[PDB]
Amino acid sequence: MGMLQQIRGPADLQHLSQAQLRELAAEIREFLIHKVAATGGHLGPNLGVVELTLALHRVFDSPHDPIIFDTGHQAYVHKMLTGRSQDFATLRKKGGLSGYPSRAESEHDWVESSHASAALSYADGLAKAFELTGHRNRHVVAVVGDGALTGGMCWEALNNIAASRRPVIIVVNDNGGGPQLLFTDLGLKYVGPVDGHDERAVEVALRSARRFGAPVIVHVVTRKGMGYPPAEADQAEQMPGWTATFSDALIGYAQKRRDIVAITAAMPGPTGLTAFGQRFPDRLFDVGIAEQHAMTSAAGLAMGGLHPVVAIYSTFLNRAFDQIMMDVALHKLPVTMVLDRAGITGSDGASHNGMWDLSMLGIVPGIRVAAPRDATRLREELGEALDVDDGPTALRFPKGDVGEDISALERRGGVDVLAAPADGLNHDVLLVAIGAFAPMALAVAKRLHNQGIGVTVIDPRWVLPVSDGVRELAVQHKLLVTLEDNGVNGGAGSAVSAALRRAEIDVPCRDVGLPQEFYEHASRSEVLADLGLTDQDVARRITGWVAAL
Amino acid sequence: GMLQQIRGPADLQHLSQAQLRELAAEIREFLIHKVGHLGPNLGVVELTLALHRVFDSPHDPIIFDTGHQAYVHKMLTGRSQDFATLRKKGGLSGYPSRAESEHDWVESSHASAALSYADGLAKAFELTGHRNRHVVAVVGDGALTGGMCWEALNNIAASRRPVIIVVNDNGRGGPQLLFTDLGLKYVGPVDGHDERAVEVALRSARRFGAPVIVHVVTRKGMGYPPAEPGWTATFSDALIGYAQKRRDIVAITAAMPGPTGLTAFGQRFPDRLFDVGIAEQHAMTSAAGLAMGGLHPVVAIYSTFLNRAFDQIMMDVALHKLPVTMVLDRAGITGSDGASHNGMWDLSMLGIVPGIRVAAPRDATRLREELGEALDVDDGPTALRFPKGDVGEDISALERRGGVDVLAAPADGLNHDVLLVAIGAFAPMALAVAKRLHNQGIGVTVIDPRWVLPVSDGVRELAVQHKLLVTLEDNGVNGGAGSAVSAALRRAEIDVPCRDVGLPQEFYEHASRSEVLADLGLTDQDVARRITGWVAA
Ligand SMILES: CC(=O)c1sc(CCOP(=O)(O)OP(=O)(O)O)c(C)[n+]1Cc1cnc(C)nc1N
Ligand SMILES: CC(=O)c1sc(CCOP(=O)(O)OP(=O)(O)O)c(C)[n+]1Cc1cnc(C)nc1N
Ligand SMILES: [Mg+2]
Ligand SMILES: [Mg+2]
């Protein structure tokens, strides 16, 4: 890999022959295949942008010309051409190379958000900034996938960009899951379609756009996984589960009920809805990267008498907040939302962690939110959600393997008592374990037992609204501690406190969960250990509170 | 006098063109008499007659985007006699209402959603085997600048399910982009005040048996030349004052420069006002881009509409630590525009945002001061929220303690019984509560924390000196300011009892702001009686 090890930055491409560029592209593909197989990450989407990224850095002068990747999962070649080729041994590892652009890593990186369809909106802003600061001849380049182009923010941005001569180059990276509408005749100059694996053709198209001195669309066609047949074959975004359990449960319920329909915002595979679609192909809708449309179209389906199940990863549901509020909840419609990747996900960094949903959903009048503690409770809570015919329901659960089943000692006022004070200890601490933190709560209760502190561990199952069961048990204990895989601001703990205070119960409450912060990438287990969300650190904390009385 | 003898749409079916021209004139006189959004309704008289001459509501659902222009629809569906009660408590809604009519589908005033509902309903009819239901979405040129329309059109374009997209274009503030060649059948432009031409175009669309755009051109206020407050005025004046001194300040509105107070800003600094269309999401992320280019954007979006921009505040502004100031007018109860207008979500939503700072001005001087403070934050998002309407006289403070303004303190001889944390617009009510409690021998410290989030050290310091903390907020209590104060105290190991007095987490029907507050017991009499109960306990 003689060619690649000589690239210090973009200008090192500037005097290469097409033969050298072709050799470099082959070295980049070999590098990506071997590095990304070792670390995991977005191999297919990066293989598809080798020639496109070489062409961008042969035409544009980054960062004078900002290169803004929509989503940013496809910026590995960009990082390799901006001095970070030696950092791939640490890709997506704690203290290592981010899976997304990072302002901390490089002057060439602008946007760290993985939330799709935002690049063109940043581009409009930056182009306006350059005008307002009198920066000469800065060309903002937005690299937008066909998937990202199905998001509404792109239409808002293109309307704004089209109103001005400020130079924004809209590079559509089309490997399609893309738009059903034409973007050849919107009033913006259109160049293409260009073969995105013909580096010279991409350079000519971009150079032509750069010289246009006004907004222009450059439509490039690429192949996801180009050069690596397994990635080409599977068209995969990256290389006993919660998701599988959801998938199987949903198929079970849809077998007994023709009114169930499923909706994904472009992630039928990862949400477990491909298996559902194979059994009920008329009842699965993939709406593109369009969480807002997923939710309001769900409202329309419910107005026509159906019970939509909308499966959207926790973090991405932020996009649909106003649709949950004004389209679903305002109309008392039975839409069930299923939020996979709830709580810390870790390795995709700050913009992927599912740590907002309990706080956001708590704002929605009349909402019912469940957090499954295990496989059986996911099945049961899904059935209970499907039985709610008069308002929105939500289930949230983490990525990865479902923990073993924990059967309750008893159910009181909706709440599952998982553990009660044993062998002469008293009702000291009510530990309210939200969702997947049940096993950690049981380990905390055992450590506290050994300190002489008696713990009742409950799973409220339905976290919102706060149930009678929680109020009934609270008054029997000296301290209530909520333990949640969610931001503590407006989270389950603050809701439990608010519900007790509303009921004139002033038992001391503590909110143990994620501090209201953006977390850098690391494994889930490393993020939780660094925050002290471990049975050892939580038991130590609760001991201090009980000692203080 | 035919309008009073229209029972529903079928009463138009056998009218002559001369009778339709008479009825349109009667509808225009009735609208002026009774109205609410007059201009938009005068613009859709012939369009609405034509819709109800072609489509069979509600077999053919007629969904108004935003729904402010559905008065003629109500008059043609048996509700003309109800206009005596328009936007009055227990009276006719300013928006479509499923409770009022089988002909009404969507009650949300939030623009650009109609096509998404239309997609879902069309899908439902297919899945339930309902024959020959044509969903009609009536979308304004403004509404069509919203991202939801692009998501909906992309989905609608993928299917033969009949959705008729009726574009009500009075902008020729609509799209800069062409919708004449998206892959969808396009009919028009049609003269929207030629009832017969509009029916011909619509009938063509109904018979097409696939999705179709019918482009209709209307004049807002048509037939009526005339159509052809203090808090906001204070914001406008203050922003102009700061921008005079600072070249880095830019203002952004999502299609509301006049009502947000930004027209006067644009008149002085025309290169520094951006109107992005009805595009709250783009407003916030373009703000992020402007801040990345070294500017300090001020984004003026009414409280309720800021819901749309939640993920852009989170992942585009806050994640990058960018200095965007959000200014939320119409914060708290607005009343007569009903459930989807009340600015009662913002303190709960903004509280989720890492590193956010949120101010709630108590008066004109504090709006000026807190805006100046926001403009000085260079490393993260700031927000100011204030109500619709006139602002009263300044409320003077006795002292500032850890950022917090003491508005009242217990009389010499009374104990420090209650810390009454008065958020923004409820300072006058908190001072009235304090005077009533004084008369019962109950000592009250009233504070305006000014910066509600994060909860200040001044709140923590005063809390430990009182027996009871009561927060009073013009916001939903779930995740609201009271719950945030409680959470901050408990985090600081302070277990002083806290009570969260504010709006229950409910959608409110239309009524005046005063009526809504009185019905919830948000009055100085009712709050003082509640606090008396707690103090006794
Ligand atoms: C990484 C991640 O979170 C991805 S990558 C991806 C597909 C992107 O398709 P596009 O065509 O734009 O790119 P391509 O990979 O080059 O084909 C999705 C749906 N997601 C999840 C997702 C969902 N919804 C939103 C709003 N943002 C993101 N990032
Ligand atoms: C009433 C209201 O809240 C209206 S009507 C309107 C302009 C509508 O323009 P359009 O061209 O669609 O309609 P026209 O009146 O027929 O011209 C706006 C900005 N708003 C406020 C607004 C802002 N943002 C959003 C998401 N929804 C609304 N309703
Ligand atoms: Mg793609
Ligand atoms: Mg209009």
Author numbering:
A (entry chain AAA): 27 to 202, 223 to 285, 304 to 613
B (entry chain BBB): 28 to 62, 67 to 203, 223 to 278, 304 to 612
What does the original paper state about this entry?
1-Deoxy-d-xylulose 5-phosphate synthase (DXPS) catalyzes the first reaction of the MEP pathway and is an attractive target for the development of new antibiotics. DXPS catalyzes the ThDP-dependent decarboxylation of pyruvate and subsequent carboligation with d-glyceraldehyde-3-phosphate (D-GAP), the second substrate, following a preferred-order, random-sequential reaction mechanism. Here, we have applied our previously reported truncation approach and removed a disordered internal loop, to successfully crystallize the DXPS from an important anti-infective target, namely M. tuberculosis. Following the truncation approach, we were able to obtain protein crystals and report herein the first pathogenic DXPS structures: a holo structure with bound ThDP and a structure containing the enamine reaction intermediate.
The asymmetric unit contains a homodimer, which adopts a highly similar fold to the ΔMtDXPS holo structure, with an overall RMSD of 0.2 Å. Residues 289–295 are visible in the structure whilst they could not be modeled in the holo structure. In the active site, density could be observed near the C2 of ThDP, consistent with an enamine or acetyl intermediate adduct. Since we could not determine whether the enamine has converted to a less reactive acetylThDP state, we will refer to the modeled molecule as the enamine-intermediate. We found that the enamine–ThDP intermediate is engaged in several unique interactions with ΔMtDXPS not seen in other structures of DXPS reaction intermediates. Glu293 makes hydrogen bonds with the diphosphate moiety of ThDP and the C2α-hydroxyl forms hydrogen bonds with Ser112 and His426 through the highly coordinated water also found in the holo structure. However, it was possible to identify the electron density of a phosphate-like moiety and model it with an elevated B-factor of 49.3 Å2. The electron density for this moiety can be observed clearly in chain B of the homodimer, while it is more diffuse in chain A. The phosphate is located in close proximity to the enamine intermediate and forms hydrogen bonds with Tyr387, Arg415, His426 and Lys473 with distances between 2.8 and 3.4 Å. Chain A of the intermediate structure shows a partially folded, fork-like motif with Glu293 interacting with ThDP and only weak density in the D-GAP binding site. The fork-like motif in chain B is disordered but phosphate-like density can be observed in the D-GAP binding site.
